[PDB]
Amino acid sequence: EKSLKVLEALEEFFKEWKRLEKEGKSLDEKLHLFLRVGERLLEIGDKESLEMLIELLEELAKEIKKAGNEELLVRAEAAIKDIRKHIKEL
Amino acid sequence: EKSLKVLEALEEFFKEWKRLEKEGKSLDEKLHLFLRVGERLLEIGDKESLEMLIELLEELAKEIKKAGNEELLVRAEAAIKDIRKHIKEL
Ligand SMILES: [Zn+2]
Ligand SMILES: [Zn+2]
Numbered sequence: 001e002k003s004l005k006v007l008e009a010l011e012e013f014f015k016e017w018k019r020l021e022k023e024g025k026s027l028d029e030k031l032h033l034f035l036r037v038g039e040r041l042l043e044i045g046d047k048e049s050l051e052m053l054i055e056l057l058e059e060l061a062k063e064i065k066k067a068g069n070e071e072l073l074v075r076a077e078a079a080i081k082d083i084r085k086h087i088k089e090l
Numbered sequence: 091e092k093s094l095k096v097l098e099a100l101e102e103f104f105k106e107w108k109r110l111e112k113e114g115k116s117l118d119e120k121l122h123l124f125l126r127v128g129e130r131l132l133e134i135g136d137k138e139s140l141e142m143l144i145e146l147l148e149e150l151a152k153e154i155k156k157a158g159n160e161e162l163l164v165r166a167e168a169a170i171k172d173i174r175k176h177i178k179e180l
Contacts, residue, residue, distance in 0.1 A: 032129060036130070082118075
C-alpha cells in the first residue's frame with residue numbers, strides 16, 4: 001500500500017506540474033508544489049521518488065537563480081539540502 | 091467541503107503534534123510537521139487557521155534559537171515569512 005501512496009502522490013505532482021507549466025503561474029507556486037510533494041513523500045518514506053524530485057528541484061533552483069529572487073533561492077536550497085540529508089539517512 | 095478538509099488537516103496536525111511532544115522527538119520532525127500542515131492549509135484556501143500555525147511556528151522558532159542549530163532556523167524563518175505574506179495576500 002506504500003506503492004499505491006507513492007503512485008497517488010506522483011500522479012498529483014504530475015498533474016499539478018503539467019498544469020503549472022502550461023501557464024505562467026510564477027516560481028512560488030512551483031516551489032510550493034515541490035515542497036508539498038516532497039513532504040508527502042518524506043512522510044511516506046520512499047527513495048527513487050525523492051531523487052527525481054531533487055533533480056527537478058535543482059532545475060527550479062537554476063531557474064530561480066537566473067531570475068532576480070534572492071529569498072526564494074534560500075528556501076529552495078534549504079529544501080534541497082534537507083531532502084539530500086534525509087535521502088542519505090534513509 | 092472546504093471546512094471538512096480543514097478539519098482533517100487540523101486533526102492530523104493535532105494528533106502528530108501530541109505524538110511528537112510525547113516521545114521526545116527531534117526539532118526537525120516538528121518543523122516537518124509544521125511545514126506539511128502549513129502547505130496543506132495554504133493549498134486549500136484557509137485563513138484564521140493559518141495564524142494559529144504562525145503563532146505555534148513562532149514558538150517553535152523561539153525554541154530552535156536557544157538550541158544551537160543555525161541551518162534549521164533559516165528554514166523556519168523563511169516558512170514564517172512566506173506564510174505571513176500568503177496570509178496578507180489571502
Ligand atoms: Zn529534515
Ligand atoms: Zn510562497
